[model samples]
Target: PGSMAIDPNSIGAVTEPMLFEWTDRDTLLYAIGVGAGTGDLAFTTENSHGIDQQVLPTYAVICCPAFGAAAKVGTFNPAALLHGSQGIRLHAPLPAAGKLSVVTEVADIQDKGEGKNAIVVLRGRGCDPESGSLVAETLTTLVLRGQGGFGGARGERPAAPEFPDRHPDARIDMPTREDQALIYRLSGDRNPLHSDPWFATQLAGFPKPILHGLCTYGVAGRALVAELGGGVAANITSIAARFTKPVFPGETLSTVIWRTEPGRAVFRTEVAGEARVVLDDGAVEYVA
Candidate 1:
């Protein structure tokens, strides 16, 4: 196979600051994309009479910091890349609308197997431009298929905590519409693999367009906020997981949660009907 376009030595490189701004309209639209409705008025509505508008904590992933170094490191086929794991920690409750100055660093890179795949990890941070205070921190892992063997250090993947032995403390069922991906794109991440049938089939090796994993992850985030946070958006502090499988649109996601302690928990997301797990080794930290 031909070599991947990535520079293995680019690890530890940091990118220049990038600016990202989102409005209430964008936040509300993202809420809808992840299945929030009238039931979650704080996130889905901007001007509800009695309730004030709030953004979902997980929205930080959408307006995440720029990893410009990722582009410079390599130029593999864009379709060959997949999001392997995602995580975000919020320092403060996200506003309904806001702007952020984002910065990213290439934490590390590893080759999985000879001619098999490669992994690139990035650490990103977002801050309020005026005060330069940290607002969000994120860890992003990208898997590049069949682009390995370029010679790099092999590293261990961060393991997710195991689930509790007994039954889940809370089980939340989240459903996705056939057009969920269609709406999720408006918030950002307008990749055609989630919307263009031909592009997905020919370019991405999927039979049809698939739902964004982040959308499903956001659905799980909403579930935690609803069940554990007492429907309060800010109560959930951090959410993260590894994407183990692809989720097609129009499938129901069942998030099984176990409250490990007063403020810590573990979870897994499955396709409701098939019993197939899409998100694995999940964890959510929140305050009651």
Candidate 2:
């Protein structure tokens, strides 16, 4: 509708390091938002089972830049933005409470075409503030629908990773509450599209508000931990997935897993009863 605010040449530009400090309360809150129930007492309570609360491996997604940060740097439209995919490399287990210093940079901005939409890649590297030790690294891919043809390069798009042809070895069914987006918003993502129907229908062109991409990411991470990591957070070393479709609240998420080798698996999430894949190219590396 108007000229883009971002410049294609601004690729590789780094944002100021943002410092964040969180506590066990925050970690617990995040767990609840992702549908962690009483069964997941370790995530939902600090003293449950007479042990300390542990952070979920997927909680690392929220420790970095906001999804809209790319738009602020370049001429991209926030309303047209969509979470394309996410990848995380865990250097070490995340503590329940600590401080993280994060630096984000515009890795690449590609113009798919006038009608095909543009894609922006952002990479965030986080380190422990006090020890200065590496914590985790996250790469985010965002699609700016209807925001292209501004003379940017049409870079090659990477295809989703291939999985085995056989059936999944295991499957986990996770149910999300109707108020999932509402509770999830408390964990730093307050996008109206996830909670406001008017905003979703009028601006985002959705019939109703949709679930946050990260929330779904967390759910899938939980499933992977349960299936591959023996329900231990420390067993998970890395997890990555592509956000292919939108999921509504109150729907059951089914994660199908195919183990490639010891401590490694490829998985995908589907909307129960619909047979539609909402997440794809999912892979996780864990400890035996």
Candidate 3:
């Protein structure tokens, strides 16, 4: 295997300031539809109109470009890497429609050594435009399964919680249609990996076109509503989790949730029968 000849120092201390427009009502609703909220119409309204729904908060981790650190790494092909883990922390509820800004940077890069693996942590902060307040922070880990050897030091990343903490109290199963990528692309992410089959096969190492992580995010949200509480999408307040694996079309997803408190729960979603958990260390806090 060809060792990476690029500078390992390229990623360190790299920060990019982000600017975004105010969240609109529909965009806020999009967050809930994706499981950021716990299927509460009222909660969805809060994000839409800037009002409180119940206890569960509205959370949506927007997938934006320029925020992609691997792409910024310059030499590595971003399509070859996968999202290792992602977590969202809410400082305050976000508005449905408005402009905003986000600051992102490479937190660190860890080399797993030869024949092992390497990982990079991309950290970002999204803020409100009017109030100048911090809306949320996202921490994402990108795993390079076979890429390493740039001499970057290993093992300086943040630790994730162990998986399978509790059984999923509810489950949702949905078959992604052939055009699943089209429907998910409306959510503001235009990753070619989801739409271009030729690129997926030739560039990203996939046999066919695959689904976006956010698309799976939407399916998991539907599960929380239909199974967990049998509620509507608007009632959900906040939904966040770490993605551990890639999901292709037609794979069955088994969403497992455990009630952490009377009105709050932790969850993880995986492809049925697969040892690798696609989503992990997740929690949802909402109105009971």
Candidate 4:
């Protein structure tokens, strides 16, 4: 929040059309990146015995035009850029293989003050290149450390759904691999922030490269798809969460869920290694 290098004037800036394409192979690899394995045949194999390959609902965030658009928010060290939150509302369950022709827009930019960080929100939407129908939408909120003091507006937060006061109705344990980031990179999120130790440690000051937050998001989405939605991947229409901390690779994540109402639920994912909440303010909407 001291001196800054990012331009707050970039707010509401709209970029030219950006496109991303993915195939069954790409979706398969993306499934594995998020911890899918042999047991999850429908997601891991395209030519399995009887099961048809399915794309994880959260994959929409990965195969969108929003991936590299954060750089357009302004100039700042990539290391100083952190994911504050993410939200995705699926217009349709992703096909096993598909493409996105979307536009990225800087939706909002907020200066948190000299004592805090700045916030930038990038939104993406795509129409079927052939059909001209809206297919998917995603929003990524980035937190820029020491990038405040641009005298920008401080935005207000919408009231979040409250988690039930009682104990959670269910829990999902997601154990990640030591090379999770390596696997996730093949899915098109080839960010050195999750790989190169020199960049992760020396530049970002993390002890080591950390797992991608979307990896956690994907894993959690899978858990919701299987447990809460009765394994109906298409049932979930929306998923949103606030990422509060960094999760190192090879950690076990514990996600607890609460069915707050019909067709709706909330969750919080915690890491067993340090026993801390990594994803909070989580909420999901589904059609029964």
Candidate with maximal lDDT? 1
Per-residue lDDT of candidate 4, residues 34-142 (tens digit): 9999878988998988887878889888766454556676665332224478888888778898777888788888887876788878888877788878878888877
Summarize candidate 2's per-residue lDDT along 41-141 as a digit string, tens digits: 88888876687777898887877543435754574432232457888878887888888899887888898777667788888888988788888888888
Which is better, 1 or 4, measured by TM-score? Answer: 1
Off by over 4 Å in 1: 77-83
Cα distance off (Å), candidate 3, residue 229? 9.0
- TM-scores of the models, in the order given: 0.93, 0.92, 0.72, 0.92
129: Cα error in model 2, Å: 1.0
- Total clashes, candidate 2? 4
After TM-score superposition, the amount by which residue 252's alpha carbon in candidate 3 deviates from its true location, in angstroms, is: 4.7
Query: How far off is model 3, as Cα RMSD?
Result: 5.1
Arranged by TM-score, best first: 1, 2, 4, 3
Candidate 2 TM-score, true structure as reference? 0.92
| Candidate 1 worst ten-residue window by lDDT | 74-83
